[PDB]
Paper text:
[name] ([name]) is an adaptor protein involved in cell signaling where it interacts with a number of tyrosine kinases via its src-homology2 ([name]) domain78. While co-overexpression of [name] and ErbB2 occurs due to the proximity of their two genes on the 17q12-21 amplicon, [name] plays a role independent of ErbB2 in cancer progression. Following the conventional nomenclature for [name] domains, the [name]-[name] domain possesses a 3 stranded anti-parallel β-sheet consisting of the βB, βC and βD strands, flanked by 2 α-helices, αA and αB.
The staple forms close contacts with Met495, Asp496, Asp497 backbone and sidechains in the EF loop of [name]-[name] and Ile 518 in the BG loop in the same way as seen for G7-B1. The staple contributes 55 Å2 of the total interaction surface area of 424 Å2. The Y5(OH) of G7-B4 also forms a hydrogen bond with a malonic acid that is bound in the [name]-[name] domain pY binding pocket, with the interaction occurring in a similar fashion to the phosphate interaction in the G7-B1 co-crystal structure. The thioether linkage is well defined in the electron density, positioned across the top of the stapled cyclic peptide, linking residues 1 and 8, but not altering their positions compared to those in the G7-B1 structure.
Numbering used by the authors:
A (entry chain M): 1 to 8
B (entry chain A): 426 to 529
The structure:
C-alpha cells in the first residue's frame, strides 16, 4: 500500500 | 512514546532487523521506531515466519484533531500506545499479534 513497507 | 519499552527511537531499518535477528527471529517479536522517510511518522517492525515486516504509521488529521493509522484511515489511533495495545489482542491488517517486546 505504501512503497517500501508491508502495509496490506 | 518515550517511556515505552517497545519504542527504540531513531534507529534504522537495518539495525531493527539486526536486533530482531539477534533475538532469535521469534514470531511476534516487535518494536516501533521513528521514520526518517516519513518525518513525523513511525515504523512498526514485526517478525513473522522468520522475516521482518515493516509497517508505516502515518499521522493524519480529522477535523483538526490528530490520529495515527497504518491503513489509510480505516483504523485510527490517538497515539502509538493505543495502536500497540490494540494489536496485542487484534491482528487488524497484521499477519500476527504483537507478542514480545524487542529489548531496547
Ligand atoms: Na491501523
Amino acid at each position: 500500500s505504501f512503497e517500501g513497507y508491508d502495509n496490506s | 512514546h518515550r517511556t515505552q519499552l517497545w519504542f527504540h527511537g531513531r534507529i534504522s531499518r537495518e539495525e531493527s532487523q539486526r536486533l530482531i535477528g539477534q533475538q532469535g527471529l521469534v514470531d511476534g517479536l516487535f518494536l516501533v521506531r521513528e521514520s526518517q522517510r516519513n518525518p513525523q511518522g513511525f515504523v512498526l517492525s514485526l517478525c513473522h515466519l522468520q522475516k521482518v515486516k515493516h509497517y508505516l504509521i502515518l499521522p493524519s488529521e480529522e477535523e483538526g484533531r490528530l490520529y495515527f493509522s497504518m491503513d489509510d484511515g480505516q483504523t485510527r489511533f490517538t497515539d502509538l500506545l493505543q495502536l500497540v495495545e490494540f494489536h496485542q489482542l487484534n491482528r487488524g491488517i497484521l499477519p500476527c499479534l504483537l507478542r514480545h517486546c524487542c529489548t531496547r
